[PDB]
Structure formats: structure tokens, C-alpha cells
Amino acid sequence: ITGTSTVGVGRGVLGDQKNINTTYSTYYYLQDNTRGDGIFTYDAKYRTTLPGSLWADADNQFFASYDAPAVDAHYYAGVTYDYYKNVHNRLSYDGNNAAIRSSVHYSQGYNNAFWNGSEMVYGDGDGQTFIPLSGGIDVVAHELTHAVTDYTAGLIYQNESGAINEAISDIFGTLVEFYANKNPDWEIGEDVYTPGISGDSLRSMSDPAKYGDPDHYSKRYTGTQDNGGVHINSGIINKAAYLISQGGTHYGVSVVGIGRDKLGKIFYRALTQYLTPTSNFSQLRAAAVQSATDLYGSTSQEVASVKQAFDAVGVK
Ligand SMILES: O=C(O)CNC(=O)[C@@H](CS)Cc1ccccc1
Ligand SMILES: [Ca+2]
Ligand SMILES: [Ca+2]
Ligand SMILES: [Ca+2]
Ligand SMILES: [Ca+2]
Numbered sequence: 001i002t003g004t005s006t007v008g009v010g011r012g013v014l015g016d017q018k019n020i021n022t023t024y025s026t027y028y029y030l031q032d033n034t035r036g037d038g039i040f041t042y043d044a045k046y047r048t049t050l051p052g053s054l055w056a057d058a059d060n061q062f063f064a065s066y067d068a069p070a071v072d073a074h075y076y077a078g079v080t081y082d083y084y085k086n087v088h089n090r091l092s093y094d095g096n097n098a099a100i101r102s103s104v105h106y107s108q109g110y111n112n113a114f115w116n117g118s119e120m121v122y123g124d125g126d127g128q129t130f131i132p133l134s135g136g137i138d139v140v141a142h143e144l145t146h147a148v149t150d151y152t153a154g155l156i157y158q159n160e161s162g163a164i165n166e167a168i169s170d171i172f173g174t175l176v177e178f179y180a181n182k183n184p185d186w187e188i189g190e191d192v193y194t195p196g197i198s199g200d201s202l203r204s205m206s207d208p209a210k211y212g213d214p215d216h217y218s219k220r221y222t223g224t225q226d227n228g229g230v231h232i233n234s235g236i237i238n239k240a241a242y243l244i245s246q247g248g249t250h251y252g253v254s255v256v257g258i259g260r261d262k263l264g265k266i267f268y269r270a271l272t273q274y275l276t277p278t279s280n281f282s283q284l285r286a287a288a289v290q291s292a293t294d295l296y297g298s299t300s301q302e303v304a305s306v307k308q309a310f311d312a313v314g315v316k
């Protein structure tokens with residue numbers, strides 16, 4: 001759409017009011033011209049055909065219940081772009097300001113969200129296991145992060161390299177939740193999962209075992225489901241990341257925490273410079289050691305906390 005940039009107001013899935021960047025040309029569109037090549041939000045209209053229609057609204061006000069998921073997918077994708085640009089100096093997912101597109105209201109009672117190789121897609125949930133997926137900042141950044149991986153390391157979605165792919169997305173979606181200061185935590189999906197139950201989440205970075213995921217290499221899933229346990233074995237890498245950051249004793253091994261910022265710096269560098277499509281857990285270890293080395297020196301505490309963390313989860 002070609003038109004005048006303006007700003008509208010709306011209510012998100014959680015009932016919160018926010019301002020969003022729109023474009024005016026007869027109608028008001030969910031098209032934000034201020035970020036790279038633009039952020040575009042689309043209506044999939046309960047169908048599976050993508051992307052659906054560019055979101056059009058008559059008065060620049062987004063307070064209807066059908067509007068809520070479009071408001072949050074549009075705004076959180078702006079926050080995510082901001083995080084990457086400001087913190088890591090990366091312009092959009094390809095590093096060249098590619099336009100970011102999202103479709104909401106995808107299918108009927110679709111309990112997922114994904115990156116299809118070209119855009120982000122959000123189901124509205126069934127109302128019980130989930131509420132519309134874009135209402136969770138960590139879900140939105142997990143997604144966008146898959147775009148980042150795709151253009152960099154290119155981790156294949158299966159087995160060891162696939163679980164690394166999932167871990168990276170949980171790690172960066174968690175960094176983005178803390179960056180926005182939106183009630184942050186080391187849990188994944190908490191804001192949109194099981195609206196009827198309090199206190200839970202889909203996955204836990206602090207204690208993956210809390211929901212049955214492995215928190216040690218020796219407890220890794222060797223089967224075939226979930227592409228070889230991509231969303232299962234990600235817990236081993238999530239635990240490691242949470243240790244480097246915050247510190248702690250796990251299975252007897254003590255790790256001194258180096259905090260979030262350094263954790264984001266080391267992982268981004270492993271991602272962008274050292275990891276390959278076929279990298280395994282052991283290779284992720286050498287990549288993270290080497291990034292921390294590059295940035296803080298071979299004899300830094302930074303390097304020593306990364307080794308401790310991997311030894312704690314049995315990776316190497
Ligand atoms: O597909 C699965 O098994 C679970 N899906 C996920 O973990 C991702 C899709 S890769 C979508 C999502 C991320 C974070 C939070 C909620 C939903
Ligand atoms: Ca309106
Ligand atoms: Ca939170
Ligand atoms: Ca969270
Ligand atoms: Ca819940």
C-alpha cells in the first residue's frame with residue numbers, strides 16, 4: 001500500500017491498550033513504514049490460504065475483539081525488529097531490512113504458530129489450551145527468530161541441529177521479553193497458554209523437567225516423534241543458557257552467572273559466525289566457547305561460565 005504514515009490505537013489479546021504504526025489510503029492499514037522495508041499484518045479469515053488480505057480498518061481504532069490478535073502480532077513484531085536492530089545491529093531477519101509479514105486468524109481453533117519459510121502465522125487457539133498466539137511476546141520473537149536462523153546458520157529441523165534451532169528461538173524470545181520489560185521470566189508461552197490455569201507455561205528454561213523435558217544429555221529423547229524431539233531436546237540447551245545467564249548448581253556442577261546481555265552476545269555470535277546447518281550439541285559447545293573467547297578472552301570468567309554450563313548438562 002502507498003499512503004500516509006499515521007498512528008492508531010488498539011487493544012491487545014490481554015486487554016492492554018497500545019499505539020500501532022499504520023498507513024492511510026482510503027482505509028487505515030496494518031502497514032508500519034518506520035521499520036526497514038515495513039511490517040505488514042494480514043487477515044487469514046479462518047482459512048489456510050496465505051497470507052490472506054492486508055488488514056484494513058475504517059477508523060484507525062482497533063478495539064474489537066476480532067482486532068486483538070492483529071494488534072499484538074503487528075506491535076510485537078515491531079518490538080522484535082527493534083531488539084535486533086538496537087542490541088545486535090541486525091536490520092530485520094535477513095540483515096537487509098526484508099519486510100516482515102504476519103497472518104492472524106489462521107484456520108479454526110488452531111493451537112499453534114509458525115514461520116513458514118516466508119512469513120509468520122498465528123492460530124487463535126481453541127480457547128482452552130490456548131488463546132490467540134500473538135498475545136505472547138515470547139511466542140512472536142520465537143517465531144521471528146526462526147527467520148533469523150534460516151538466513152544465518154540454517155539449522156536443519158531435525159534431531160540435534162533441530163533442537164538447537166528451537167533452543168535459539170526460545171532463548172531469543174526470552175531476551176526479547178526481558179528487553180520489552182513485559183513481566184519477564186524464563187518460561188515460554190505463559191501469557192497465552194491454558195487461560196484457565198494459573199502459573200504454568202508450555203516449556204520452562206529454568207527447569208525444563210517441570211513439564212517432562214530433559215535437563216541433562218543423558219536424558220535425551222532418541223526417538224522419531226517431533227522430528228526427533230526438536231521441541232523435547234531443546235530443554236538441554238535451554239537449561240545451559242539459563243545457567244550461563246543466571247548461574248546455579250545443577251547435578252552437582254556449579255556455574256557462575258554472567259547475565260542476559262552477555263548470554264545474548266555470545267549466542268548471536270555463535271549463531272551468525274560459527275554454526276552450520278548440520279551442527280550438533282557438541283559443535284554448539286565449541287561455537288559458544290569460541291564466541292565467548294572472541295569477545296571476552298580465553299581466560300575470561302565468561303569463557304569459564306560457558307564451559308561449566310555445558311558440563312552441567314552433560315554436553316561434552
Ligand atoms: O509445535 C509445537 O509442538 C509447539 N510449538 C512451538 O513451540 C512453536 C512453533 S515452532 C510455536 C510456539 C512457540 C512458543 C510458544 C507457543 C507456541
Ligand atoms: Ca476500527
Ligand atoms: Ca512473562
Ligand atoms: Ca515468557
Ligand atoms: Ca495458564
Ligand SMILES: [Zn+2]
Nearest residue numbers: 142146166169
Ligand atoms: Zn519453534
